[model samples]
Target: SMNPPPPETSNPNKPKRQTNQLQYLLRVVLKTLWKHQFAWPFQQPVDAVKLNLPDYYKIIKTPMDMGTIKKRLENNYYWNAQECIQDFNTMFTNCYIYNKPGDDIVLMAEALEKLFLQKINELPTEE
Candidate 1:
């Protein structure tokens, strides 16, 4: 008796449900939802510069509260800029995991992150 392998969706260790979440996260990170907040000009993709933490969560609906988490680290007196960047890199790495075997997605993630980091690094001091 021969059995066909299970579908890719059946893998319990994989992020089968992360696609939409990741998409929404990208949109929020790119600040697509903040146009109405600050009367900014609307455009395709988005301008991450206009992003606010509360507005980002309103758009993404993830359990993460980046500000609160960072504050927790600060309260614990264990925070560092490098640690925060490392944490986000790890989070984005998990996000990129779903399609890593596909070169297109990997390249897209790499390019997006590269540009994203450049822009993120330039963010205002308040952020």
Candidate 2:
């Protein structure tokens, strides 16, 4: 009789689940940011049509936010931490470039940006 091969989803012998869990703490970081008061404005994609910023799209080619990230998180759209981190950076960077420096909203983004970076560094395994 042939021995059955083990499943890929769970295997205590390898780092399979270990690597997969790196993103677990990452999600905690995001959920915290999602609830942060400063996250209010960045919770959803920007609406340029009604805002009267006709060139908003011209300024920012790609807009991102917590709400969209949450969707991607649930759907497993991000393959690794880098992809997820890049999207977060895109969200904040878009705000930074579009809003005037020192503006209230800009400050809000910077505030949350600090928390994001700190938690990212705090991830147990940088692997």
Candidate 3:
């Protein structure tokens, strides 16, 4: 006899999860921007521009005030972008921990920082 292995949900499919997460994250980020007095033409499924973000995460125009947001940051409730790319990488560390294969929760933690996030506009088919 031996101990049983974990369920399929435990070790989910990584590739699919990454794709799903990318979409989910973008949604939550946009929603936060909306909550922070940012406007958009639609409710979902499109890239958000830099203009949507207010000070890149400084000014809090959401349900709460900036003071609370600052306090939370002070209490280690979140990470800030102090070093650009390095901080960006650090900010998302362990974000995928609770995210299973299909858990598209739209993690607000990293989502908010992605105000200026982008992808290659047009990659050529071939040389």
Candidate 4:
């Protein structure tokens, strides 16, 4: 059964088994993202096995198909935008760049808006 059946998340009869499995998975995830030095947007090639690639299925084939790749890339863009806004606000609020001229939040916001607009222009318009 290559696809097999979905695991029953609500099943309570396999607590110990589920716990051990989750623990092992958590270890694998940590090893993949942390010890293996493979985080998002590597901007280079990678060897999946050595990198302990994150997989939705613990099977022979990974779930990183075209649709999944597209979704992940979209998610990466959204995540970057979120972090950029957060970090920009934090920098001004925390006064990290103290006494810096043109550090007004309004200006920063406008700059970010323009940058995002430029990026949006680069993308093909949808209808």
Candidate 5:
């Protein structure tokens, strides 16, 4: 019984209701993300691309997030500590700058970044 839900991946009853079946997963995932409060971003902010109010995005320069940075660190593609730390640092800069000082990510960044000076102040004294 492997993936035996709709037409059933391992075993099929029939192939009649395929189109609606295929679209089912897409509907669930999109609405699920949209419904979530935290990472659930701008509603029609999807349209901000065409409007470029996130011309903020353009100025933010580096586009990244928790998941991507975590994956990159875990995936073993980084060549140096500089690049690695830069990833987090860039995320901090972009987030604090992109979001308002009074808005969500800025305060969040301040808290998490407190750990940064802790780890960093202990790390290098090359200056």
Candidate 6:
């Protein structure tokens, strides 16, 4: 007989037989963001992982879907309106100088965000 499913264990001290998916995903995202030198709008450049560890712990410990976490990163941190304006201005300058006509401004603006994140990933960490 399959031993009655071992009582759910919460002991962090002992080697875990179960896994918390959210915690694992959160750690991976945070580590990647840290490597890219990602920074919040309100904060100076620093390791995003170290700065947000406590908050990350809270998030993983609680019951929340990945979509909720994804939205927070998209709206509050990365896809911020003010930050998007800067990317827009840069694109506009290039278009103005090259005399290139842009067909769809909205899609172009979104592309800028994607490019910026890729560039960030390539940058060397200062610390």
Those runs of model 5 whose alpha carbons end farther than 4 Å from true positions after fitting are 1-56, 124-127
RMSD of each: 16.5, 11.9, 18.8, 18.9, 16.9, 18.7
Q: Could you tell me which residue pairs clash in candidate 4?
A: none
Q: Candidate 4 on 26-115: residue-level lDDT in tens?
A: 333222322322223222222345455443134222122212222323333222333223322432333223224565634543444344
Q: What is the lDDT of candidate 4?
A: 0.31
- lDDT score at residue 113, model 1, on the 0-100 scale: 60
Runs with alpha carbons beyond 4 Å of true place in candidate 3: 1-82, 106-114, 119-127
The weakest ten consecutive residues by lDDT in model 1 span: 1-10
Per-residue error for 59 in candidate 3, Å, reads: 31
Query: Model 6: runs farther than 4 Å from truth?
Result: 1-103
- For lDDT, the strongest prediction is 2
* Tens digit of per-residue lDDT, candidate 3, span 6-77: 112222232222232333323443234445432221222111133343332232211222233333333333
Pairwise TM-score winner, candidates 1 and 2? 2
For residue 23, model 1's alpha carbon misses the true position, in angstroms, by: 20
Ranking by TM-score: 2, 5, 1, 3, 4, 6
Candidate 6 structure, TM-score to reference: 0.20
Q: Model 1, which residues run further than 4 Å from truth? A: 1-29, 32-91
Off by over 4 Å in 4: 1-103, 125-127
For model 4, where is the 10-residue window of minimal lDDT? Answer: 60-69
Q: Residue 71, candidate 2: how far off, in angstroms?
A: 0.8
Q: What is the C-alpha lDDT of each candidate?
A: 0.37, 0.71, 0.30, 0.31, 0.44, 0.33
lDDT of 6 at 39: 22
User: TM-score per candidate, in order?
Assistant: 0.30, 0.78, 0.22, 0.20, 0.49, 0.20
| lDDT by residue (tens digit), candidate 6, 27-124 | 44433432342222212211226545334332222222223333333333322333323432443343333333554533343454465455444543
3 versus 4: better lDDT goes to: 4
